[PDB]
Design a protein around this ligand. Structure first.
Ligand SMILES: c1ccc2c(NCCCCCCCNc3c4c(nc5ccccc35)CCCC4)c3c(nc2c1)CCCC3
Ligand SMILES: c1ccc2c(NCCCCCCCNc3c4c(nc5ccccc35)CCCC4)c3c(nc2c1)CCCC3
Ligand SMILES: *[C@@H]1O[C@H](CO)[C@@H](O)[C@H](O)[C@H]1NC(C)=O
Ligand SMILES: *[C@@H]1O[C@H](CO)[C@@H](O)[C@H](O)[C@H]1NC(C)=O
Ligand SMILES: *[C@@H]1O[C@H](CO)[C@@H](O)[C@H](O)[C@H]1NC(C)=O
Ligand SMILES: *[C@@H]1O[C@H](CO)[C@@H](O)[C@H](O)[C@H]1NC(C)=O
Lengths: 528, 528
């Protein structure tokens, strides 16, 4: 039977699912780790003990314990990112969509979800792998991983809560794909890991981590990179946050053992209820529990690793959206609201830059403000809104990614860069937010192919284009079928726009601003 | 007789001069001070002792001792600024052009020449007052003043070489105009002082100095302002340069008296031969002997005087040219030459910014470079040439003037701002230099009215326009005859272009760059 597969860990039974009036098989909720519960919380994951009998893989698994966004109750725009399954600490599962009939040895794609390392689920509707699996004849895998404190509480030196365990959850699911995807028709010599936001940062982290490099072939990073200012912290900062988390729950703070033991007796929701209270600064686009530069998962600082070529050398395809920042200003900056055009005053602009570059002194805040202000029209509410939007996006997503691509390209075997700037026709978010963080995903997963979702015909055409680029690149290391997406080189630095208009090639993506964020500002904050 | 005038110091005999096929009287070389020679060198000027008999004022006087530019021998472009009379320390004279028939009580204009406080003459052909005197029915005066070490050697505390004596020469000639211009038909209640470059800075200095304020009514500043970075130094820096001047002549350096006595036994040319060796940095647009903030001529720092309204409150008319910087790069920056288009390499660009902002550390030099570099086209030789040109002009002329106008306007009684960007048709300098420092003077003095000088008819029309604005403003405090040059206000900040095209009004002259030069860079150099 097509829905029964014997793996090294046991047999799993899938279910047949309909897709654009055809069908493919889906194996949902396959376990790849022992439930990280009880004394296991905060700890490195353990491989799932083999089982006898047949595992029922016909329904989605629980999503990991996470903060639930309640800003716009029932609003689909934000509801679409929240968990759509009961949450549970028992959440280490993976999902597989397999073309039908079952392939023999085809291209594999492993999706790693974003959500700032504090949230995220593999079961969201925009992450439904059936359309891509089906349209491109690829075996699609979506893994899961512990987020929030459960995944990233870091007390370096201790072995009970070492940090980075959520990264290790990902690595384990990747080890499982490596060990068992052959039974589902997947070629393990050809797996592409791809992810968005924290997922895109994660992908880059596996490219850097020696212990992860051999478990995959190629990589795709969407609006995220490992060196993002919000994606990692030092062991000292990780320690200070774990301790403050402890102080918020009236835990005994005399030893790592006392702290950890106390954190383990707490219900999941108690940790989530105070998670945000440990951030050191008033900020926007910063998360409490994230990966730590520990000397193990990351042997040295990310920058020295990038400088010395200390990373997996292969091909990569990556990019950013036009307005990465709008979503974070809506959520935490004064003057922005979902139902107005959000014209910002100079005062709110300035409190906006303070929030956006939390780690900056007055001279640095003055440098950002001068760089983004049109002084012939300083009180233009729309220019202030838009400037703040670019500040958030440039600093948090775009410029860190450009610094990663330029460092990678000096040693890699091929880079393809994209700029996604299509504002979808059925977007339910206000116009001022533009091409939002996360809104290229639906095109990558091919949602515009389903009529009922109201996209235009040209949007369906763009989706097919992107899906075919993503899968052709996963299969060959080049998105083009043998109109060309030029290779990004150290010299020319070419990239493409990804929208419904005819393809245009440009060069040096936001160089002007990125020289400021990658070379000038860091130097300024170092001298003063 | 029309050419004989009795003044409080004695009788002077002028000469009749032809002007655009008419005639006016000229009194040249009238003395207003005792020759500052021998033991008088470096000292405050003494009023000229009255004489009996008739002073022959029919020919130009000697020009003060100064460095003579020999870069382009015989080239008119640069030759036109060099002394056209024998040089002599006996040079404190003034010149008067009087309409004919002699007026009774008309508007007076007193010209103060530029030349970086180290050079300059009142007798240059572009400074010929007959055209303006004649066309606008104004009594035109051009004064002279000691330059170089002779005018600005500063050993604060000593009374033999106190500093600022060249400023005091100007003040004395102004006291003479106040005391005697009535006999030439001039109204002393209505004298406008106007000057260019160091002359424009000088004008602003008399506006600030309590001891000069009562000697004039209105002021015009062309491409220069008192707060320019090259127009003044502290008493300590002035002292260090006087001492180094001394060290260059093997003078005894044990006391001010020993130093001064030694400097006084030296021939004029010995001082000029080593004048440039005392500059502290390798620089462009910096001069050795300039005014000092001494607590006497300037009671406190220029900025605190500007902040508190401590200055003469009246009307002012001022402006800058499009390419103030080109001339100084031609003379001292690598890669520029008179006979080539001067496309600059990145290396020369960078050595150019170091020369232009001599007082800056590495972080500051990086800030200037980022502000003026198009990073999508960093190796464009023309963009590098042009960027360096704006850097010199913005930092040395334009942004200091805009900071002065904005501070002045908060207390003054009327401001009129201009931007001169007409490239004259007969210019002998290469195209790349644009609208050069000093090339608006010929229009102010009306040289385009004389056919033989080859200007176009529209250039003649512009000259008449400017002359009429300058004189109407000197007579009334407003350049418009009762198409309007709007008043520059603290709120609107309006200004006009001054060229052959129809008048256009704009706002906030180079705000973007001036916020960088007036507010950001100074703060950055202060913190680091
Ligand atoms: C843990 C985490 C956050 C917390 C928090 N604010 C922060 C709440 C932010 C909720 C946004 C939902 C994400 N949802 C989104 C995603 C994407 N795009 C989006 C685009 C638009 C809107 C939401 C998006 C791309 C993929 C990743 C997910 C706060 C608190 N606790 C927290 C405890 C206590 C009260 C103060 C605020
Ligand atoms: C004293 C002063 C300068 C010296 C110097 N370099 C510097 C020499 C510069 C000569 C330029 C002539 C001005 N002449 C000019 C003026 C205007 N515009 C111009 C526009 C173009 C060209 C010249 C101009 C506007 C009004 C003011 C005058 C040097 C030395 N000594 C000096 C000793 C020793 C050798 C090294 C160079
Ligand atoms: C698998 O689980 C689902 C959902 O709980 C159930 O409806 C289905 O019948 C199960 N199949 C088997 C054979 O266990
Ligand atoms: C990738 O590597 C192959 C073989 O090692 C080499 O021939 C090819 O040029 C490389 N491609 C790029 C873009 O570096
Ligand atoms: C004035 O001086 C000039 C030049 O030296 C001379 O030619 C002229 O005749 C003189 N006039 C008188 C009366 O001194
Ligand atoms: C100048 O002063 C006069 C009288 O003191 C005043 O009425 C007028 O408004 C002033 N003009 C400006 C532009 O300040």
């Amino acid at each position: 039977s097509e829905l029964l597969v014997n793996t090294k860990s046991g047999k799993v039974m899938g279910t047949r699912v309909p897709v654009l009036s055809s069908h493919i098989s889906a194996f949902l909720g396959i376990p790849f780790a022992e439930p990280p519960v009880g004394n296991m919380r905060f700890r490195r994951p353990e491989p799932k003990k083999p089982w006898s009998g047949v595992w029922n893989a016909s329904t989605y698994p629980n999503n990991c314990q996470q903060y639930v966004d309640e800003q716009f109750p029932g609003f689909s725009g934000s509801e679409m990112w929240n968990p759509n399954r009961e949450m549970s600490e028992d959440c280490l599962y993976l999902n597989i969509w397999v073309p039908s009939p079952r392939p023999k040895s085809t291209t594999v794609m492993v999706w790693i979800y974003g959500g700032g390392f504090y949230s995220g689920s593999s079961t969201l509707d925009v992450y439904n792998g059936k359309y891509l699996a089906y349209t491109e004849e690829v075996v699609l895998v979506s893994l899961s991983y512990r987020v929030g404190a459960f995944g990233f509480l870091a007390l370096h030196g201790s072995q009970e809560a070492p940090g980075n365990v959520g990264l290790l959850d990902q690595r384990m699911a990747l080890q499982w794909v490596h060990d068992n995807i052959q039974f589902f028709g997947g070629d393990p010599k050809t797996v592409t890991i791809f992810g968005e936001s924290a997922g895109g940062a994660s992908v880059g982290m596996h490219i850097l981590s020696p212990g992860s490099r051999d478990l995959f072939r190629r990589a795709i990073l969407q609006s995220g990179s490992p060196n993002c200012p919000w994606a990692s912290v030092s062991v000292a900062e990780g320690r200070r946050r774990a301790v403050e988390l402890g102080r918020n729950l009236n835990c005994n703070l005399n030893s790592d053992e006392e702290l950890i033991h106390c954190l383990r007796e707490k219900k999941p929701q108690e940790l989530i209820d105070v998670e945000w209270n440990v951030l050191p600064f008033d900020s926007i686009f910063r998360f409490s529990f994230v990966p730590v530069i520990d000397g193990e998962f990351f042997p040295t600082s990310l920058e020295s690793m990038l400088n010395s070529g200390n990373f997996k050398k292969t091909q990569i395809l990556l990019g950013v959206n036009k307005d990465e920042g709008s979503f974070f200003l809506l959520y935490g900056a004064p003057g922005f609201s979902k139902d107005s055009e959000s014209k910002i005053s100079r005062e709110d602009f300035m409190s906006g830059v303070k929030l956006s570059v939390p780690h900056a002194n007055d001279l640095g805040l003055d440098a950002v403000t001068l760089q983004y202000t049109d002084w012939m029209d300083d009180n233009n509410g729309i220019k202030n809104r838009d400037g703040l939007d670019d500040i958030v996006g440039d600093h948090n997503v775009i410029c860190p990614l450009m610094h990663f691509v330029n460092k990678y390209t000096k040693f890699g075997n091929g880079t393809y860069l994209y700029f996604f700037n299509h504002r979808a026709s059925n977007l339910v978010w206000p116009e001022w937010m533009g091409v939002i963080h996360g809104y290229e995903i639906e095109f990558v997963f091919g949602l515009p192919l389903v009529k009922e979702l109201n996209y235009t015909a040209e949007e369906e055409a763009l989706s097919r284009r992107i899906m075919h680029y993503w899968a052709t690149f996963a299969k060959t290391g080049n998105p083009n079928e043998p109109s060309k997406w030029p290779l990004f080189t150290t010299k020319e630095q070419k990239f493409i726009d990804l929208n419904t208009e005819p393809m245009k090639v440009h060069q040096r993506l936001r160089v002007q601003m990125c020289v400021f964020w990658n070379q000038f500002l860091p130097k300024l904050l170092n001298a003063t």
